[PDB]
Design a binder for this molecule. Structure first.
Ligand SMILES: Cc1cc2nc3c(=O)[nH]c(=O)nc-3n(C[C@H](O)[C@H](O)[C@H](O)COP(=O)(O)OP(=O)(O)OC[C@H]3O[C@@H](n4cnc5c(N)ncnc54)[C@H](O)[C@@H]3O)c2cc1C
Ligand SMILES: Cc1cc2nc3c(=O)[nH]c(=O)nc-3n(C[C@H](O)[C@H](O)[C@H](O)COP(=O)(O)OP(=O)(O)OC[C@H]3O[C@@H](n4cnc5c(N)ncnc54)[C@H](O)[C@@H]3O)c2cc1C
Ligand SMILES: NC(=O)c1ccc[n+]([C@@H]2O[C@H](COP(=O)([O-])OP(=O)(O)OC[C@H]3O[C@@H](n4cnc5c(N)ncnc54)[C@H](OP(=O)(O)O)[C@@H]3O)[C@@H](O)[C@H]2O)c1
Ligand SMILES: NC(=O)c1ccc[n+]([C@@H]2O[C@H](COP(=O)([O-])OP(=O)(O)OC[C@H]3O[C@@H](n4cnc5c(N)ncnc54)[C@H](OP(=O)(O)O)[C@@H]3O)[C@@H](O)[C@H]2O)c1
Lengths: 459, 459
């Protein structure tokens, strides 16, 4: 049997643990699917590349408003797919070849599960091919997998998820999306901008439900006029028809289209590990960790989607950095170990219009007993908004009345994930709304003026 | 004769002086040209509206690179001008009616000059129509006007400036621009993106002379391959040809095109006032002011292009705010007066590629005896750059080696005037490079990641 000092399950953020302080340790790396994890191959990187091409075509479509007459000749979808994954696919292969060609690193390209704990305290791990080995320390970075409602699985009908939809053979003409979360908004924007008709089936009444009240309402109303919304509807049946899909809904409604995309959330992969037998406490399928990314089993760490309350790459990378440090400390010397920082986690939805958020919503601050100052700033009230002829963009800021402390910011409009970064910075370092507005210059007539004027109109 | 407590020359930033603390004072407002100043009518606001429409045509032109085949049918220049100035002209009119319709405000639509000082210390002012009045306090906000080299004036040939080119009858096919400043770059981007051929005549070797060495160099080579660059050449003669222009150069070379634009700097309008006669010291044509926006004459303030070392609207507005406060104190009570803050002044050039900067250049920091860390970060080395297929965008950051203090930042690339705002904030509030890089989250995979990785690569 092979002996290892460390074992890492998952090559997403889990691939970022190894640094100079680990050379000289024999480590085992386990990857079920493609090397590099979800973000690089079927997540953040390819999706946003698809979003950019979509927004380029959206620009051509609405060019007449600015006095430029244009039209779209052809959408070379095969060339779009090939250009994107033509740069991604070699990276996963070369990145796998970098670990394989290391003398101290052994790569196991199989699904790995926890075996029984050995007498000496080490952990046994076995793959689906029956290859076993031991390791003194283990990191669980197994990520998550898409959740599919039971009725679609029971009907055995062919479907798409985020993991398959980006490599469809050719662009469909009508696409149903079940669900209305981050994945649904982005992929509805991508395909509709490329000409596809879109139908959304959501069990609720609104899109991006957990966003701020103002954003959720306004975003849903805008979406309703460009995509077909079937509110308050679950799928209870589905079947094929030639090359089309039919969706039977809970009220007897039907939805017929060429393909279906299921965007109904994801599920942590902590249940596919035999974790609880080895002392790794599970909350349903989520690995439980403390403030140090430590599980309940000794010398076992977890990070990322498999354990974090956030399904975000910039959180998973920070959690891996915590694990990278805490693996080189004694398991019980907690005060030489570093804690995870979830204090001001931001997020963005690369849909149309783009959305970005950090901190508390308005309702969250009132429900926590805050005396709030609030402002909603239209893009159209600022010079850069004039050049855009913008009528829907907004930035909403919530602040405490006493100190001027920044409590939340939520943007729906052009460059949302960009112009929110100063608000992220101010919150993370205790900058007040007064200081941020007038203790620094804002370039005229650049877009950040919309944030500046939002701070000045806090009432 | 009419008596006034305050007199304001210029309705640009000078129109933003009047505030609640001024109701109850008889005010005289003098505007030679159009109400609102240069920025609103012939500057920042109208120009950037043209930059956005140009970038839409840019998007259509290079759309096949992203897999969308499109093309431009026609450029409705008449509709562009009408849409832009269709919103601007009513704003200048309505804003003029707001001051006119005030009982305490009297508007004089003529060129106003300083008369001899009256015995009581009051100031006499006369218009071009010969109407006189007195005022106890005066602000000079006369701005600036373009400088034209002698040979173009001597040749009596028709020319354009920033004040006229934006309302031209029809788009030329070829346009000469003399000079290589902010106005030259922006207007070169505007018209070339709309199909016009561009020729630049500059007496130097570079196009963005006062920018950072790296930015100035790289921007020039990019310009040389898309616009025709006439290095180290002055214009010594010019004459007509049908409806075309011919430009004779100092080495006997010629440049033939449809129209000419002079972007050869601006000159403060302090010489059109008889200022020195009333004790207003002038530096050539610039009114001199101290750290309190006070001139050398008693009860006379200055702000904007007429006195500031910066021709920037966000500086002109802050100086007007300084004047707004200091006007309500005794002329000698300097310790109750506020000082203007010219620290960390930012600027941006809305060209292609866009440029934005704040703080010192690399050369400036070494000349100040700084042990510097430096980094140049490619957009293409960051996930958002992949979605752009970006090969030219860069971010340059200079920091002190000891403390990590941020000394300067310079961006050439997409959304430059946006993604620089966090660096402005950090410098204005003493955030170090270490805290800024890892004391806060950055949204993955948003454009600000290019700034984050620049801080991490300070070497
Ligand atoms: C469509 C989509 C778009 C997204 N867009 C964004 C975005 O714009 N911004 C953002 O911040 N986040 C985004 N996310 C979220 C982000 O991708 C995740 O938070 C991130 O991938 C989590 O990283 P991880 O390493 O924890 O998981 P993963 O990257 O999924 O790593 C888990 C890896 O381990 C493998 N594995 C699992 N179990 C085993 C096992 N037992 N044995 C061996 N190997 C195993 C898996 O196959 C996988 O390769 C997106 C997610 C999706 C699905
Ligand atoms: C083409 C161009 C583009 C620019 N783009 C930007 C940009 O993107 N961002 C930015 O921050 N800055 C920009 N600027 C600079 C900005 O426009 C100026 O810094 C700003 O206008 C300064 O305001 P002001 O009130 O000092 O001058 P002005 O706005 O020019 O105010 C002076 C006014 O007073 C009048 N006046 C002058 N002398 C007299 C007199 N003797 N009697 C009576 N009336 C008089 C003038 O007619 C004018 O209306 C740009 C400038 C130009 C030329
Ligand atoms: N740019 C980004 O940051 C980005 C992009 C993509 C994904 N992500 C992350 O990836 C994760 C997954 O995204 P997601 O959009 O799939 O999930 P999500 O954001 O959690 O939204 C899930 C959606 O699916 C619906 N749904 C769930 N179960 C359902 C069922 N059984 N029947 C019908 N509808 C059902 C939900 O309805 P209810 O709300 O009523 O339950 C909701 O509309 C999230 O954590 C998200 O933040 C991030
Ligand atoms: N977005 C913005 O912030 C923005 C936009 C437009 C303008 N502005 C400001 O407005 C002001 C005016 O802009 P500008 O472009 O007119 O001036 P500028 O930016 O100061 O540049 C002036 C240019 O004219 C050239 N020049 C001067 N005298 C010349 C001569 N006799 N013959 C030939 N070339 C000559 C200069 O060459 P040398 O360098 O060798 O002197 C330089 O290239 C500046 O202060 C600028 O910052 C700001």
């Amino acid at each position: 049997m092979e002996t290892y000092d460390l074992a890492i399950i998952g090559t997403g953020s889990g691939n970022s643990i190894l640094d100079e302080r680990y050379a000289g340790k024999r480590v085992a790396i386990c990857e079920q699917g493609t090397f590099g994890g979800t973000c690089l191959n079927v997540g953040c990187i390819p999706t946003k590349m698809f979003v950019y091409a979509a927004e380029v075509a959206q620009t051509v479509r609405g060019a007449a408003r600015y006095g430029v007459d244009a039209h779209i000749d052809r959408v070379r979808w095969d060339d779009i797919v090939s250009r994107i994954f033509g740069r991604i696919d070699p990276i996963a292969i070369s990145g796998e070849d970098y670990r394989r060609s290391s003398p101290n690193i052994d790569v196991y390209a199989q699904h790995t599960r926890f075996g029984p704990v050995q007498p000496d305290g080490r952990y046994l791990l076995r793959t689906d091919l029956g290859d076993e080995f031991t390791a003194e320390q283990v990191v669980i970075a197994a990520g998550s997998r898409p959740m599919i409602p039971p009725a679609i699985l029971a009907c055995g009908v062919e479907y798409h998820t985020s993991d398959t939809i980006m490599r469809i053979a050719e662009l469909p003409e009508h696409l149903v999306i079940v669900g209305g979360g981050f994945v649904a908004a982005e992929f509805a924007h991508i395909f509709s901008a490329l000409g596809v008709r879109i139908t959304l089936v959501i069990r609720g009444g609104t899109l991006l439900r957990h966003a701020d009240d103002t954003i959720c309402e306004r975003f849903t109303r805008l979406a309703s006029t460009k995509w077909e919304l079937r509110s308050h509807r679950n799928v209870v049946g589905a079947h094929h028809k030639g090359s089309q899909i039919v969706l039977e809904l809970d009220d007897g409604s039907t939805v017929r289209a060429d393909t279906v995309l299921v965007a109904t959330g994801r599920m942590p992969n902590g249940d596919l590990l035999d974790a609880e037998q080895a002392g790794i406490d599970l909350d349903e399928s989520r690995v439980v960790v403390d403030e140090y990314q430590r599980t309940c089993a000794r010398n076992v760490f977890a990070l990322g989607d498999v354990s974090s309350p956030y399904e975000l790459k910039h959180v998973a990378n920070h959690e891996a950095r915590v694990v990278q440090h805490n693996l080189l400390c004694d398991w019980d010397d907690t005060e030489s170990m570093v804690m995870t920082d979830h204090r001001y986690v931001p997020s963005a939805v690369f849909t149309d219009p783009p959305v970005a958020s950090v901190g508390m919503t308005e309702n969250q601050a009132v429900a926590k007993g805050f005396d709030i100052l609030c402002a909603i700033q239209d893009y159209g009230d600022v010079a850069y908004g004039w050049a855009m002829e913008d009528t829907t963009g907004i930035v909403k800021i919530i602040a405490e009345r006493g100190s001027g402390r920044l409590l939340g910011a939520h943007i729906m409009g052009h460059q949302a994930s960009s112009i929110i970064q100063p608000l992220i910075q101010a919150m993370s370092f205790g900058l007040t709304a007064q200081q941020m507005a007038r203790g620094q210059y804002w370039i005229h007539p650049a877009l950040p003026e919309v944030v500046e004027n939002a701070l000045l109109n806090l009432r």
